[PDB]
From a paper:
The pathogenicity of Shigella sp. is dependent on a complex macromolecular machine, the type 3 secretion system (T3SS), that delivers into host cells a set of effector proteins required for invasion. Blockage of effector secretion before host cell contact is mediated, in part, by a protein that has been proposed to act as either a physical impediment to the entrance to the secretion apparatus, or as a gatekeeper that determines substrate hierarchy. Across bacterial species, this protein (known as MxiC in Shigella sp.) possesses only weak sequence homology and in some species exists as two separate polypeptide chains (e.g., in Yersinia sp. the homologue consists of YopN and TyeA). MxiC is an elongated rod-shaped molecule with a long axis of 86 Å.
Residue numbers in the entry: 64 to 355
The structure:
């Protein structure tokens, strides 16, 4: 570890369902039903699950209830065993939701987004089985154009914290796969940024006829389906022709692909296909334009 005394008190502050007062009552009702007077734990579970549907929140509520200074005695055992039932087979998802709660609140307030949506986001990222491009397309769709870069920062900050937690969502090897996933995502952001600068110098976005988001998606599809670059660019061409010569828009894509991280494509072979097609497009356009 091996010297950080993790941790760890403060469970209630990591609960993302409701309001500080709305959560505070809920925890008291569970303190009132009842560790102080000596009930009775069956269907008390359905009360727990009714107040907090999310397992991360459910676990945090019981950990707070485990703070009561009674501290008798078999009640500890019953509280800790309900914790095991909720967590069992869901360790990853629970631990990720807990470990990223403060970041979700931090970024939630910054992005003007609901924290629990960011919690779902980080869980989805470490537990999903979708590609880097699909993941990027999903975030773009879910959170918006404005939030596309910030969302990857939130995941990175959540990952950092998760790895430093006393109970991380993954083991070393699994975080290794997550780290690789994240760097690949960051490469996509890098081309996203490169691509945006190329559209600026081309001014293909100034008038507002073309949307930066749809243009981005077009570039993302090229990373996925290089052989269909020509078809992918069809709807762009139908609009750009009004003020831009075909070769300008094709060059914008060629150069963006040229100077972007190679690893965004499935392989170098697939990257060559994209470059060869876009060059063929640029070349054909120029010859048609100057002659005549």
């Amino acid at each position: 570890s091996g010297l950080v005394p993790r941790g760890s008190h403060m469970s209630q502050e990591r609960i993302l369902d409701g309001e500080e007062d709305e959560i505070n009552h809920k925890i008291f009702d569970l303190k009132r039903t009842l560790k102080d007077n000596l009930p009775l734990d069956r269907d008390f579970i359905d009360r727990l699950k009714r107040y907090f549907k999310d397992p991360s929140d459910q676990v945090l509520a019981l950990r707070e209830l485990l703070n009561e200074k009674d501290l008798t005695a078999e009640q500890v055992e019953l509280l800790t065993k309900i914790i095991n039932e909720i967590i069992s087979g869901s360790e990853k998802s629970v631990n990720a939701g807990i470990n990223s709660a403060i970041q979700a609140k931090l970024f939630g307030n910054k992005m003007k987004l609901e924290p629990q949506l960011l919690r779902a986001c980080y869980r989805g990222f470490i537990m999903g089985n979708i590609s880097t491009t699909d993941q990027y397309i999903e975030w773009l769709g879910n959170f918006g154009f404005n939030h596309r870069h910030t969302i990857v920062n939130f995941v990175e900050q959540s990952l950092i914290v998760d790895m430093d937690s006393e109970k991380p969502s993954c083991n070393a090897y699994e975080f290794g796969f997550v780290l690789s996933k994240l760097i690949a995502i960051k490469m996509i952001r890098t081309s996203d940024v490169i691509f945006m600068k190329k559209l600026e110098s081309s001014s293909l976005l100034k008038d507002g006829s073309l949307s930066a988001e749809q243009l981005l998606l077009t570039l993302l599809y090229i990373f996925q389906y290089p052989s269909e670059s020509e078809q992918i660019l069809t709807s762009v061409i139908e609009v750009s022709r009004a003020s831009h010569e075909d070769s300008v828009v094709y060059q914008t894509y060629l150069s963006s692909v040229n100077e972007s991280p190679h690893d965004i494509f499935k392989s170098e072979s697939e990257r060559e296909i994209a470059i060869n097609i876009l060059r063929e497009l640029v070349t054909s356009a120029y010859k048609k334009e100057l002659s005549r």
